[PDB]
Write a protein that binds this ligand. Structure first.
Ligand SMILES: [Cl-]
Ligand SMILES: [Cl-]
Ligand SMILES: [Zn+2]
Ligand SMILES: [Zn+2]
Lengths: 49, 289, 49, 289
């Protein structure tokens, strides 16, 4: 069954830390981790507005 | 595996597993440590007494500041069931060997680092912080020719998984490294939560297969603690024995320990660590039933 | 070059809408979309606390 | 493609492309519409005048309420360069045909829906809302035997991509469907932003290849507007001609339109839509240089 995981990352615009909380299978968690090691970056709410 | 479970339990009841551990020599009799013994390399070893044998030390490309290409690290190679296993066992980097460490990671094509320690334990330094902090200086840090960037961290109960990007500053080449840090080892003795250590081994196995699939080969993983022999030996012996049990190879634990000691002195440095390995194997087999 | 994209999804605990803003290549965007169609779900900040 | 660009431009300067469009019959002379013509099926067609030919209508499994398995939808099949292309051209679902629509999606193994319209345009209904709204009722809705759940939406400038999960409520089987909605078509006439329409075609092509790779076969995509002939015909003709140009097949646009009309009456219902297709092809070729 899916479990809860927390992903810590950095906003790609302003160096602020972003806390993402997901529920997923282990395989989908690994796939999501791998996206951060490709090109996927998150924008914090402030930089988004 | 039910026969493997009962066999292991019987051996633990025979009262000789600690007897045979004492008789395993801690290091090779005619061992040669030429490069590690040079006075220029004294400051590059965290524990002066724990150094690699010459024949399987990890040799770096020479530089003007490090002309023998010396790092306190050993190639550990074991063949189990037609499969070659390759580890690099090394000490926790010092402030002035972080660039050596990343140079080793690059030359050896390492995808996975298994760090079986905290940076500081009970006030004493076990490892320099050789990877960046999230959100600090663009989450990046530079060690010699290598720019390292932290992209994510996922905290589990007993360990943390950190994804890193490593850039070679002359070629511009970028690579991925996964940093897996066990966070549950106590300041003295061995962890009481055996299941948590098994979860850490699970994550190492899972990340190794993931990184191998991405490179669609099988580089060594790097394992380090403080001197690279104690907890490092526990991890390596445990993974090798779990694989031996899972594919029913008739290798005895003391025989495997002797082969590891043939390749790096002092691997598993206390009886308590050796007994911990057996409890890891018992728990793995109980998990199977 | 990476572009900015917005992902709208639902919290897996409370039905609130979540707006995620990413920058990524097209391929990593598609891979991220596919994770929502597997098991990956996000938890809103309130349900996270 | 430089010769293809110059050839296309010359033909557009010859003054006959609109002449030949008028002479393309809007529908087959000896066309048969037996099932669509039944009085029980009158209310199932949005535009009474636009119905599928009997030989290639999409036939659903009969039910007690819909015993002829009727939906206003046609199988469109064209072979270009050894490749078979398969579309289902259909009308925008009515409130009482949403369960028919999802039944068609299931039986035909459809992975991609291309919706070339808004739900309401200028006050007039073009399509029922046959997929859920995010955050409304667990982002889910049930249409007959099918429970549909919206998992994400990504808005682009000219179109929106929505990922859906479809569950068959008797078997429990779950499937993925990608819903690609063009949002830039004006209430009357054709879009002025030709590049945006090309971006939409790009997304359809990209999502089709993605879903095909996931099923590691090539089901039809569903294309619909209001009656399933006008904007639907623009999309299908454009994709087929862009592929013809990209792989240098000597098929004339009016010849392709004749073949589409052989399979569904009235495909491309105005000269302005036909001229829009040519401007799409001109822009695609200019993009190449
Ligand atoms: Cl004993
Ligand atoms: Cl004309
Ligand atoms: Zn920011
Ligand atoms: Zn919530």
């Amino acid at each position: 069954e899916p479990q809860r995981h927390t992903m810590l990352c950095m906003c790609c615009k302003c160096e602020a830390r972003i806390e993402l909380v997901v529920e997923s299978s282990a395989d989908d968690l690994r796939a999501f981790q791998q996206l951060f090691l490709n090109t996927l970056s998150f924008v914090c709410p402030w930089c988004a507005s | 595996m039910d026969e493997r479970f009962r066999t292991l339990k019987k051996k633990l009841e025979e009262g000789m597993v600690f007897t045979e551990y004492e008789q395993i020599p801690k290091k090779k009799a005619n061992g040669i440590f030429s490069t590690a013994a040079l006075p220029e390399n004294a400051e590059r070893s965290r524990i002066r007494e724990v150094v690699p044998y010459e024949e399987n030390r990890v040799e770096l490309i020479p530089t003007k500041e490090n002309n023998t290409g010396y790092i306190n690290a050993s190639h550990i190679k074991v063949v189990v069931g037609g499969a070659e296993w390759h580890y690099i066992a090394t000490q926790g980097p010092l402030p002035h060997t972080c660039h050596d460490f990343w140079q080793m990671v690059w030359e050896q094509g390492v995808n996975v680092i298994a760090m079986v320690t905290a940076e500081e334990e009970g006030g004493r330094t076990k490892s320099h912080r050789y990877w960046p902090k999230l959100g600090s200086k663009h989450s990046s840090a530079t060690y010699g020719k290598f720019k390292v960037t932290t992209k994510f961290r996922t905290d589990s109960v007993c360990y943390a998984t950190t994804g890193l990007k490593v850039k070679h500053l002359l070629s511009g080449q970028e690579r991925t490294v996964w940093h897996l840090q066990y966070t549950d080892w106590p300041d003295h003795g061995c962890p009481e939560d055996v299941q948590g250590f098994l979860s850490y081994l699970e994550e190492i196995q899972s990340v190794r297969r993931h990184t191998n699939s991405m490179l669609e080969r099988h580089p060594p993983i790097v394992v380090h603690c403080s001197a690279g022999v104690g907890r490092t030996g526990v991890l390596i012996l445990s993974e090798l024995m779990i694989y031996c049990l899972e594919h029913n190879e008739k290798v005895e634990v003391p025989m495997m320990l002797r082969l590891l000691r043939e390749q790096r002195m002092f691997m598993i440095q206390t009886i308590a660590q050796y007994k911990f390995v057996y409890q890891v194997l018992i728990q793995f087999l109980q998990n199977s039933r």
